[model samples]
Target: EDLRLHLLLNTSVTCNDGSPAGYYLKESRGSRRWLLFLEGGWYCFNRENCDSRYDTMRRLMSSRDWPRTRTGTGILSSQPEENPYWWNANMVFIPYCSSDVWSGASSKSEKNEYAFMGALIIQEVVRELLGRGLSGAKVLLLAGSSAGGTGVLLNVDRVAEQLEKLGYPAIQVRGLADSGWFLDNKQYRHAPTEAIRRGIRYWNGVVPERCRRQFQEGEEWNCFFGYKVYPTLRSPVFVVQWLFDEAQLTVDNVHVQEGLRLYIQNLGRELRHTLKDVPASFAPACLSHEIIIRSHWTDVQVKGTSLPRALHCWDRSLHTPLKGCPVHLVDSCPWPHCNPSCPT
Candidate 1:
């Protein structure tokens, strides 16, 4: 029972099932600020994965099942009591159907029955939004969670550059990536290097050159991992991730039993080292996945400051350069579930 969002379809773009692609738009009566969020669903890089995923969660690969409207959550929330910052801005929710983590540029062919146009869909969406007041927008933030969060990391620079090239150079473009950061730990049961390679070939994925240029031949797929590619991002981004991300642990097929201590602490250490250079970020000492859109989002704090508060400081610092504006809120606690708000 959501209210006030209108679905707009774009025939210029197509989902995996050849259905016209579109996004849910919530227009603000008097605000030029805009937030475009990409919805998250896991992807398939091979025929087996594709076939199985389609048989089960076909909604990820097809748009026919998408609801006409959806209630916003986390940073996308319109209620000021829940989301004090940027609540009055125009909002856009983009549904995922490409099964490529929103990084593909290729269209469907007879060989591959599904379209891999995630990256192209974002580009097209912006092109469409420009006519709908985004051209005159004061600030435009592209945000997403889980795979969508990773999508934001991969595309933020490209989106920023696209805006500049499209003559909307004045709009302040930024990124808010939630729980999309993935590590390519060699210890994973299924290493991501090959998975990324398969995704690149299958989806014909497009990634940021800022990160892509750092690798040598045949290692082009390395850019897909967030830890590897994050160092090269040109546009400013604020990452919100759990120190003990459930998804990261699952990649290694980890069972949180007896030996969880050593493995977990090491993961926390790695996160510290990996995110050290990030200027604006939040890492709670929690064993969880995405949290930005949860009802208790503000309850999970790092150093006594919630993610929303840190984000407020970051935005203010960027806009007004105040002392303590840069928020790198990584919890120093060595244990998981240390925060009172963390899931038990």
Candidate 2:
């Protein structure tokens, strides 16, 4: 009797990489372009919370009101080429260890941890995309919420620089900070008014050294500016904030106002036109940070236009109507009302 040898071919590879690194790939189909989205603070390596936030984003995008077409370009008119909307853009949730040292001594290592977390997030994004044949050009967007908003403010420049170094088209990076923090600390001396000193106190508490130094001197110690990354952020920036966000009223917004005032004072008439005072509130309608993000997207969809000129928007709903106030949105709009569906 003759014995025949048998041969088998396998098409799949298995790994023991603990937690399966390719988990996202197997989940389902998503937008071709990706968004590395960061979540707010108060999260301490909680994957479930991050996943929930991701789900919320998905829900928002899938809503019936989702803007299918951007204005003017006709790129998003429900037809290929007719629709200006950047399709195939999926949001990726990045949740870092968000412990803060100011909270207590237990978080003494938080400052370093926050920086390490930022680096880890960037690395993971690169790894996840490259592992699946994706590249920087494929990343159409980058965004964040609240404390995560701080990540964008402090990290985007570096991320953009990395993309540039990698030879990728810096696809548009848009950010939304609902009650986000965006300051370099040196301007704390010029706060909008004396009413917000407490806010400044809290700000210093969170990132003490950040609010303690001036420009280059501060960057030497503050992680917010030490990265040497600002020049890399030539991309358009969209800041979403409520005039009366509780945390902001207590910190971020007040700090921004003070910072802007200080910047204007330092620059004087030479740079006065470029700077404006952000409103403290609009018609006593206390604005919430989370609501700011929601309202911002609503406005983007309603506007039906490309960004560039429409870069930043501070709704009349959020602006205080003080005469001669330098505060204004990057784009022009009517007073006493805000157009949520358009780029006003």
Candidate 3:
């Protein structure tokens, strides 16, 4: 149960600020299956924002400051009773250092002296894992939370394609995006969409060609938005997000509770529309962000089905085509106040 920190050599891989990047590995004895998790920490749009991020420990970490010890929790827990499906799977935690959602390729910065090589980081990390032991994995899951969850949505297909080209043509791959289904809403005056627009230009992101082609030449940056990219994924993906995401609440001008509720309703409608083709999803009526990292992960439910059960069913029946828009919707709040330990 020891968390082994494997540092990627600077010569092989580097973070945005030229620091070494790496992942934590926890080996399992029961199966050769693996879970690759991308950690989430908001984002930085431009030089001023990226520079400001370096002032906090949460946003930036030096090579020596990286945690050497980690305990499995939520979906990555090693305890069989806690996470039945992936408890014994080889777990890898990819930390979030680059401001981009693991999709940037440009390292040239005008004012900020940082590397935007998230895409390269993933490429190097996967190559390293393959040489270590991941090449033998039969089943692989690419998952992430919040910003990391967005990363999963953006990079899942790329990872699968890389695996196939590396000689694992039949490798069973699935993706779980937790609290990352950001709505495409422009009604709000201070929408995060503006930040997203600036992020693309600042990072010089190399968006997937398929996603980029969806928009006009000048608006190719829209590909970075979740609503624009979700429909194009070829791999089976399960999305977990709340109708009223807390992180996104501040981006709007809504102050009253009813206004927030109305916003959430519209958000839900748009989410259902965007993810209509996705295999499965768990969208509940709550005012929270990031479910997979909390204890409520097993208890949170939609349409009388717990998150764990819904995901278990989807994972167990990957070959079957999920019919009738499996977007589990919980129309009402479970309590007068949103309680993390509320009964399912």
Candidate 4:
């Protein structure tokens, strides 16, 4: 299969004393260039639901129904799996304690959830990418919707840069943030109660009191780390937000639009090469947070003109090869209303 594909399913990849901290990669095929797709988070423990999306995408790729489209043409050529336009690449699932990690670890007793989950998942993803023979020049697109979308913005830069230092070309990294919330510590800070609640739910019985406190305090540490480390990212980005998505709020929920504007403004000239597409007052009423993957691609149009038209007929259009699929492009902006919280 020249169009080699591998779906990395969700697995418990926490590195607590070597507890197998990495994602699960499906059987490798003959293709060298790869597209890695990550699934979103709900509950940390409910790994089954998390696993389903990856499986579904993989199943879609394996099915003979997927159509092939020319690169940048935004047009699909009628070809079966044999002559497909986009190849079935790879899927990677990132798991973290959604409840325990994001519950707002205010007290000492409510902290370890963060440490034991997200960090480890990220580490495992890097390991897997390297193990698969990804080269420095290989274009590695980190994309996801909602929680997964946030992951792309936060992880791609650091991961790609690190890989570059190890001798790979800083994998041409780009992020497709769809209705996902990128953390802004200054505006949308965490509530103490949520932290304590998450702590009790995830680490209360599993870890000790002192360790829990450390975990709780570590929230800021981790946040600061991810923020400073990730913002240094220089990848082209594509961000989209639906004003009506009341699900994920910005730092100041009331001034959601302002917050986003302020952040993008601060990015200054970086916005030019970065490539951003922000269309406000465009909410897909039929969509939910879970359906963001499809939503983002729907907004990612060829000339950005007939995107709405393409999206309107997505269900019935055979020419819509990127419909309900992941298409990794080089230039783009960030996504709005993204919920980057950990899985439940």
Which candidate leads the pack in TM-score?
Answer: 1
Better of 1 and 4 by TM-score: 1
Query: Residue 78's C-alpha lDDT in candidate 2?
Result: 22
> What TM-score do all the candidates reach, one by one?
0.93, 0.45, 0.88, 0.45
Q: Could you give candidate 4's per-residue lDDT for residues 198-278 as a string of tens digits?
A: 433453212222323444643422322222323344665444333323333332342347766664433322322222332
RMSD of each: 2.1, 14.4, 3.3, 12.8
Of 1 and 2, the candidate ahead on lDDT is 1
In order, the Cα lDDT scores of the candidates are 0.80, 0.33, 0.71, 0.36
- Compared with the true structure, the alpha-carbon lDDT of candidate 2 equals 0.33
Error at 69, model 1, angstroms: 0.8
Query: What does the lDDT read for residue 200 in candidate 2?
Result: 21
Clashing pairs in 1: none
* Model 1 error, position 214 (Å): 1.7
Candidate 4 to truth, TM: 0.45
Q: For model 2, state the Cα shift of residue 49 in Å.
A: 20
TM-score-wise, the better of 1 and 2 is: 1
Q: How many backbone clashes does candidate 3 have?
A: 0
Off by over 4 Å in 1: 1-12, 188-190, 256-259, 320-326
Model 3, 315-344: lDDT tens per residue?
667644455323344445432125343333
